[PDB]
Every structure is written in structure tokens, then in C-alpha cells.
Design a binder for these strands. Structure first.
Lengths: 52, 105, 152, 50, 73, 76
RNA sequence: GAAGCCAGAGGAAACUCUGGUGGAGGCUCGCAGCGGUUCUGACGUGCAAAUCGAUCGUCAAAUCUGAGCAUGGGGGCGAAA
RNA sequence: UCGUGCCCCGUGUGGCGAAAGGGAAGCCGGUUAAUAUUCCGGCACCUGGAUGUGGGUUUUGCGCGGCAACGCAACUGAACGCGGAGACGACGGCGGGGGCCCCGGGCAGAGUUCUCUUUUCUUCUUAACGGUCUAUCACCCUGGAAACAGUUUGUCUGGAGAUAGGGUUUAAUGGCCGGAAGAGCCCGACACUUCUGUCGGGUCCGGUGCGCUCUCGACGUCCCUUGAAAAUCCGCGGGAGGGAAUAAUUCUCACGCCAGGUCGUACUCAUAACCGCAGCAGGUCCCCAAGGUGAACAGCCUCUGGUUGAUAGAACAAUGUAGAUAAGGGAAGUCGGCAAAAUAGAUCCGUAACUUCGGGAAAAGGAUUGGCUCUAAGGGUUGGUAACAACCAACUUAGAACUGGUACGGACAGGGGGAAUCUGACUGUCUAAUUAAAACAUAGCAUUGCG
């Protein structure tokens, strides 16, 4: 989780309050990273991630 | 001595001439029982009409609005209006008779 | 049209069994168009899905039979099936009688009707089972007082 | 069971990813001899042997 | 009444038919057209993401069986 | 949650910088009023009757602290 | 219904009798569980390479049972077939 | 500067091995098509670290009080030691508490209504975490008891200090309060293409118990059986060092700051998700367990919750499988009463031989059992011959009259009994898949070897 939050901060300048991780049945890890209330995850996904 | 006031409002069916307020008053006078026996109103329970299709009850005993609703439903079953009229408690001691929800077919 | 998913969702929303879920048979199409719990709650608010009331189970005959057994009915030999000790244990009866007698003795000792030594003798006699119940203990106390007054 | 180790879950992950029919573009290749998945696995039929 | 196996649906949970109530009041002898039962009888990024959610619940993103082949023939 | 019975103690709790918010819960059936201040580790509740003493307590609370009234329905 | 305990009537005492209390026993009827006595039983290419029905034994323990571990064939284990 | 040297302790010196043993700490509400004590909202706790504020202590340096049990929010504690917790069997009854079950009144809703039924049913809830007031045992003070007393269902306690009077304390799943009504639930009136909801009223007051289940506590019984260990935490002995008014603090006190990594989490757990070649009447370890009859988690019927799945339709021959009946005789049948029938619950009268005196024994043999209306007996609390009044409550036991009858444990459930002989002491065990037994084992007895 610390490596994930460090990678997010280094790549997209994203700060998080908490991260939950689970290993999927297909074998890959999935992370739910909750952002700080100051920044908008919809805005981040629209601009940096292109998730519209 | 404490007193309790009950209102049975049949204004809309009385205006529709489906519900007979005088017949309901006679039914209440004949069917309200005090100490387990009917025809024992005396000075305990007063039944009157305050007009506009309403029945008003003074009770010095522990008469229940649930019992009054039960007798109202008994009268509606006798008059074959049980399947079409509902007695809804709208206030403290006020039971109002109104039509069920009707769908236009 | 298949409505197993809608019935399961309606049961989970209403907090009841799936046998208590009523789906309107004239609105099957827009019930099937509901694929989410929000839509299920919307149909519940619209009245297309209702929760059926509980199936009838009354206690009236049980209460009437209990009142009959209170007034004494159905207690005959043809009604009895267990042994006398199974129906009412002699140990329980002895426990109740001993507790009642000891409570009455300590009450009389507190009230001062009986003194300490006569209380001790009554306690030993009660443990030795000469007192069948309270009025037996009371008449024993009264005759003891009468003998003491006659001696004095 | 629900209580499983990382190695066992990783082997199950590989088995679940391998449990698939062959793609339809495989059959259209020239000189293709594969017609189905001869190593296809089902939970009821054959055990994994872990 | 089928009270042995199941309970009766409450009358307030079922909307009463106007024609049936008309027939019942007619058989008991009440002038229904004088009281008018017909009138009483009833009868942006967030937008793009919601559209993406609606597409996600409706059409699968990929088709591993048929993505490698294109053209209907 | 802790209940404070002293007005001065409640004022000293509300003057803390850790206190982020305060709310007023009115119980008209019981004829009472509850002042609840949220701190880092504990939520402090002070209970009065509906009175001018609570009315003046409302402005004797520090101005920088946010104060809100509890609505009748808690919307999620 | 075993000790222990209480009361009364005796007996010089030691002891005797009566009425209670008490809740012990590799005791007992019997539900579950465990087991498998009997039926011209069912079944006999069976539901089953040992199952089904009724009946039966036991059921507070030498009772039943899970997991971890140990004993490995010239062997082990065996209330001993 | 230290990354180099100097001391001290040296009895001792590894790892693996339990998703049911030990163990730091999270509850409620809502949310998904599928996850939730993990997400969201609210409200908390634990561990580790850093670090201030307030308060406490201090020139009588490391607190004060009560006879005391021991309290109060703080109260320096090194090496070396002591003690406690972790840390414990099985069984029997007794008492308290939580939950479930049962009864009554009240609001709202639903059902019934030929007749009767002030009726029948449904919601009426309060978590973790805290504060406050109480609750077994035990301990502390006055005082010294035979005419012995106190006391339990159960006979134990007391001059090694009882009764009584007065207190301190471990123990709540108890009362009140915060959480917290703003939640959840029930009802009503509007709005409502959807998006979406909005606003009102409540969520109250009692009683009962040889009831079921869990937990706690004081007891008592059994052993030639005496019913784990470790990690970890705490207290005490001791006083090594550290300690100030410049202000200090080696304050386990309140408040405030930071962080908490890895792995598992779906679903089934079985007449279809496991094994048996199978979607096989087989087998496979647990938790929760409503109402009526009844002694009863016996058999039968019902509520919540689940199913209505195991090829169907028609006809009703023989012979079958399973269930029954049969006039008269009652084992004449058969190798053989095989099978079936008969007995059966409960109350009362009564019960022989033999015997290891414990048993036999439910021996044997008899009388009765429905319904209705009554009678009598068995209790609790409060209050200065109180042997009296008021209030409240539940299940048993016995007696009487009336009455229907072919029946009265009306279905269900449920010993046939006896006279003997052989045999093994008994309880127990084995030939899984033909033999459960006079076989094996058992306690008791006897012999041999070993310092």
C-alpha cells in the first residue's frame, strides 16, 4: 500500500487518505485509493486518467 | 372523573347518501356494551350527531377508539360497504370513513 | 418473462421471505425492467411490489384450554400421562415448603413473637418434617405459647 | 475452502485463466490442426490434484 | 377466505376497479352520476460517466471469443 | 461519547482548537436541548432544558466554531 | 433409591423401629447418537462392489467423535477373529 | 566528533510443529446484481513512536486520607529475586442475569362479522465504548455466646472470634445517563413520465414462571484416574542511579500529534457444488432451535423460513410388494407358535420362590381413566391475638354432584406374562462384506524372575 501511494504521488501528483487492496481471482492486485476531499476524483479521472 | 371525546366522520359517504348516519347511531346505541352487557349506556356514554355526517361520543369510562372502529367495521359489513369504505384514524380520536383508491378502467 | 431475480431483490429489500413477496401480475413488464435495488424500492413505493402479511396462527384455543386448567378442567386420570413426580417433583415441593417455613420462622423471630431457643427448636422440627404447612406451624406455635402461659 | 494459502490461490488463478475455449481466429490459420481445447477443465469433472 | 394456508391481501393494497364499484353502488341503489365517481377515480463528466456505467451494465467491454475475427463473413 | 454537566467545562471544551463542529439537538417531547461538540477523541454532550440559559450559551460559544441545528430527518 | 443429615418413639448405654431429607451406582426404561439380533422381509445386471423397512442392543460410561502426531510388511497393531 | 576501545552479565547453547489450544484492540445503521465486524456515515478501541499544554510533587525532596479492609487522577525506580494471571477434570442440585416463550392495558394497521366475538393477528427496538448507583464470596472494627446459636433443597460454621450492629472490596449480560432518535420500524396525507421524494403522528405502560437456552456464582460427589505447556502481562522485596525553586521532574494523570505492512475473504457444505467412476436413498465435523398435546429437542398438527424437485396419462386381470379385516373352533398348522394378534401411559390395592440380603419387581393378579359444574388444601408483599387487615399471583393434589357412551392413555405413543434346564459371573469387545457366541477381555486368585 505504501508503494502504491508513493507511485500515485510520484506519477499523477495524487494524494490519498487510505488504500484498500485485494488480489483478484485472476491473479492481479486491485487497489481502491480514496482521495483527499480537497481534490475531485471525477476531475482527476476526466483529465489525468481519461476515464470520462 | 375523566372524559374522552371520539369523532366518527362519515361526511363524504353521508353526502354521497351511501352511509346512513341515523342508522349508524342506532347501531352504535344497540351494540356498544358497558361492563360486558349491551344496552347499558346510562350516564356513562353519550352518542350524538354534531351534523355534517359526524357522530360524536362522550365516554366517562375507558372506551376504546379501537372498539369504535371495530363497531364501525361491523356496521359496514352489515351494510355491505366493508369492501369499499375504509375507516382511517386521522387525528387523536378522529376516525374518518373514506373510499378506497379507485383505478379508472 | 423470468422474475426470480426481481423476487429475490424484493425479498432482500422488504426484509421477508421470498414466499411473502407479491409481484403485480398485470405489471410484469415494468417489474422485469427493474434490475437494481433502487428500482425495486421505487416499485415498492409505487405499490407494484408488496409484502404479504403473516399466515394465521392464533392462541385462542390454547388460552381457553389454559383457563379451563386454571378452573380445574382436564385434570383427570385419563388426562394424566406422566408420573406424579414427573408432573410435580416431591423435591421441589419439599424445597418450597422448607423455604416457606424458614421464611415464616425468621419473620416471627424478627417480629418477636417467638424467642431464640424456641425458634431453633421449631427450625429443627421443620427440618425433621413435623410441620405439614404454615397453619400447622402456626397452631404449634400457639399451643406452645398456651403451654408456656399455663406454666407461668 | 475460504481459508486458502497464497500458493494455492495462485495455482487456482492460473487454472481459472487457462479454463477457456480456444479463440475463433485460431481455426482460421493456415495449416491449423487445433479444433478445440483438449486440455479444457471443469470443476465437476476432473480435479486439479492440489 | 383461504385463511388456513395464507393471509388475505389488505384492501388498501389493491386499487378498486371503478366499474366494479359503480356496479356495486348501483345494485345497492345509489345515484352514482349525481356524486361523480369518475372525477374521484384515479388514473458533463458526470453525465459521461453515467453513460459509461449504463454501457458497462449492458454491453461487455471485450469478446475474447470473437475479437480476433472481424468481418461478418 | 462523554456527557459534561458543567457549563464552564463545556465552554473550555469548545474553545479547544481540536473542536471542529458543534450541533444543537432539540427534543420537544422531553422539553430538552443537547449541545454536542465534536473533538478528536471524544464527542461531548451537554444537556439542558429549553431555556434562555441555553439561548445565551449559543452566543457564549466561540464564534470561529461552526454551530448547526440538527434537522428532523438525517439524510444520507 | 448408597452413604451423610433431621425429627419422633423406645432402649442404662451400645443399638432398634417409624417418617422425612439426600442424590451415589462401569444400575435401569427410553429420544438423539453409536451398533447390527431377527424377518421363508424388500432388493439380487440393486439407489448401493453390503443399500432400504420393521424389529433389536446400548445410551452418563470400558460412551461417541474431529484435527495434529507416532507405530510401516522379515514389520506394525490386535479386549486374540 | 565516531565507524576503532573499555567494562558488566555470563549455568544453558537453534528451528519447525494448532485457520477447534494460549492470544492487543470495532460496534451500530445504511449501501451492491454479486463484498462487507472489511465499503459509506456516525461513534470507539489497541499497539508503537515523537512531543507540548493543563494539573500533580518538590527547600520536611519522590502525595494524602480513613482504626482497618482499602481508597483518591498523578505518586522516580537499576542489577538481582519472589508472587500472580495466562492455566484448566467429570457430574448433581441451588440462586442471579441476558435472550426466547406466556398473560394484560394503550396507539396505529390488517382480518373476521348468517350469528357471536370491547374480538384475532402484526410494529412498540436500543449495540460497542464510557460515567454514575448497586449486587455471591471474602476481608476489617465493637463485643464475648450452654438455656448453645446461626444457617442450606442438600449439615456445615463459631472463643483460631459466632449471632447482631457498622463498613471495605473482586464480580453486571442490573437501574439511570451519554451514544440516541437524528437511527430502525409502524401508520397517514400530498407530490410523482422519470429524476426523485416531501411533510405530519407514534415508537408507551405493566405482570408471571419446578418453562427452554447461554453465562456467572457459592456448594456438594468421584478417583490406586487428581484432570497441559509456552509466549505474554502485572504487582511486590530491594534501593543502584536520578533528583529543585536559577525552577526541576526516571509524572503508568487528562487533553493534544503521527503511523499501523503481507496473505485469505465470492459460493456450496450436500437426496445436484466433498468422497463413493455419476447430479448415486450410502458416508461426511459443528453453532442458532418457536407454538399446541404430552413427563419429554418421543409420535401428530401449526408459525418464521423454505420447497412443491425427484417421467407422466388411462384402466383396475392374475401373481407380487406394503397395509388391513374376517362368522365358529383356538395351534387341530409347522422340524419348531415362524409371522401375526394380544399386553402397554398414569393413579390405587397387592406381589411368591430364590438370594451374594443389594435384588427378584413394572414380578404375578386386580379397581379406575371422558365431559361439565363445583368444593377443599398447598403462597408472596406492606403496615404497631398482626391468631389482624389491604393488595397480588401460579401450578399441582384430593373429594362431590350432574351428564353422553358401542369406545373415555378414544388418534398418537406404548412391557405379553409365567414354570424350569444347560450355559457364561456381570458392565464391555471382535471375525468391516455369511458365524456376537459357552469366544476374547475384565476384577479377584496363584506362580516365576529381578536390588
Amino acid at each position: 500500500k505504501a508503494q502504491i501511494k508513493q507511485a500515485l504521488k510520484k506519477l499523477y501528483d495524487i494524494d490519498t487518505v487510505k488504500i484498500n487492496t485485494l488480489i483478484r481471482p485472476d491473479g492481479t492486485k486491485k487497489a481502491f485509493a480514496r482521495l483527499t476531499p480537497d481534490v475531485d476524483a471525477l476531475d482527476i479521472a476526466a483529465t489525468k486518467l481519461g476515464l470520462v | 372523573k375523566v372524559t374522552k371525546k371520539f369523532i366518527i366522520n362519515a361526511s363524504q359517504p353521508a353526502s354521497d347518501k351511501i352511509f346512513d348516519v341515523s342508522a349508524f347511531e342506532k347501531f352504535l346505541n344497540e351494540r356498544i356494551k358497558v361492563d360486558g352487557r349491551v344496552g347499558n349506556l346510562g350516564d356513562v356514554i353519550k352518542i350524538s350527531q354534531i351534523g355534517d355526517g359526524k357522530v360524536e361520543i362522550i365516554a366517562h369510562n375507558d372506551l376504546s377508539g379501537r372498539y369504535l372502529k371495530y363497531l364501525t367495521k361491523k356496521f359496514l359489513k352489515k351494510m355491505q360497504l366493508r369492501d369499499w369504505l375504509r375507516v382511517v384514524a386521522t387525528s387523536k380520536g378522529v376516525y374518518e370513513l373514506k373510499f378506497y383508491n379507485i383505478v379508472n378502467d | 418473462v423470468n422474475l426470480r431475480t426481481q423476487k429475490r431483490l424484493a425479498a432482500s429489500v422488504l426484509g421477508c421471505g421470498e414466499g411473502k413477496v407479491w409481484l403485480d401480475p398485470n405489471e410484469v413488464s415494468e417489474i422485469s425492467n427493474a434490475n437494481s435495488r433502487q428500482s425495486i424500492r421505487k416499485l415498492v413505493a409505487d405499490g407494484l411490489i408488496i409484502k404479504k402479511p403473516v399466515t394465521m396462527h392464533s392462541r385462542s384455543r390454547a388460552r381457553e384450554l389454559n383457563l379451563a386448567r386454571r378452573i380445574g378442567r382436564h385434570r383427570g386420570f385419563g388426562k394424566r400421562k406422566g408420573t406424579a413426580d414427573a408432573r410435580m417433583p416431591q423435591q421441589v415441593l419439599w424445597m418450597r415448603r422448607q423455604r416457606v417455613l424458614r421464611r415464616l420462622l425468621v419473620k416471627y423471630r424478627a417480629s418477636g413473637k417467638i424467642d431464640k431457643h424456641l425458634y431453633h427448636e421449631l427450625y429443627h422440627l421443620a427440618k425433621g418434617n413435623t410441620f405439614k404447612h404454615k397453619r400447622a406451624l402456626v397452631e404449634h406455635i400457639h399451643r406452645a405459647k398456651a403451654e408456656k402461659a399455663r406454666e407461668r | 475452502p475460504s481459508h486458502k494459502t497464497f500458493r494455492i490461490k495462485q495455482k487456482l488463478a492460473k487454472a481459472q485463466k487457462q479454463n477457456r475455449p480456444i479463440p475463433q481466429w485460431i481455426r482460421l490459420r493456415t495449416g491449423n490442426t487445433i479444433r478445440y481445447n483438449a486440455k479444457r477443465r471443469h470443476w465437476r469433472k476432473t480435479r486439479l490434484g492440489l | 377466505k383461504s385463511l388456513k394456508n395464507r393471509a388475505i391481501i389488505p384492501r388498501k393494497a389493491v386499487k378498486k376497479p371503478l366499474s366494479q364499484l359503480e356496479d356495486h353502488l348501483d345494485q345497492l341503489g345509489v345515484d352514482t352520476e349525481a356524486i361523480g365517481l369518475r372525477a374521484r377515480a384515479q388514473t458533463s463528466a458526470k453525465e459521461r460517466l453515467a453513460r459509461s456505467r449504463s454501457r458497462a451494465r449492458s454491453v461487455a467491454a471485450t469478446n475474447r471469443l470473437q475479437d480476433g475475427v472481424q468481418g461478418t463473413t | 461519547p462523554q456527557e459534561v454537566s458543567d457549563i464552564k467545562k463545556f465552554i473550555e471544551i469548545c474553545r479547544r482548537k481540536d473542536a471542529s463542529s458543534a450541533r444543537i439537538k432539540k427534543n420537544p417531547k422531553t422539553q430538552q436541548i443537547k449541545f454536542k461538540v465534536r473533538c478528536q477523541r471524544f464527542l461531548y454532550t451537554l444537556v439542558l432544558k429549553d431555556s434562555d440559559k441555553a439561548e445565551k450559551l449559543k452566543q457564549s460559544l466561540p464564534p470561529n466554531l461552526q454551530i448547526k441545528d440538527v434537522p428532523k430527518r438525517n439524510k444520507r
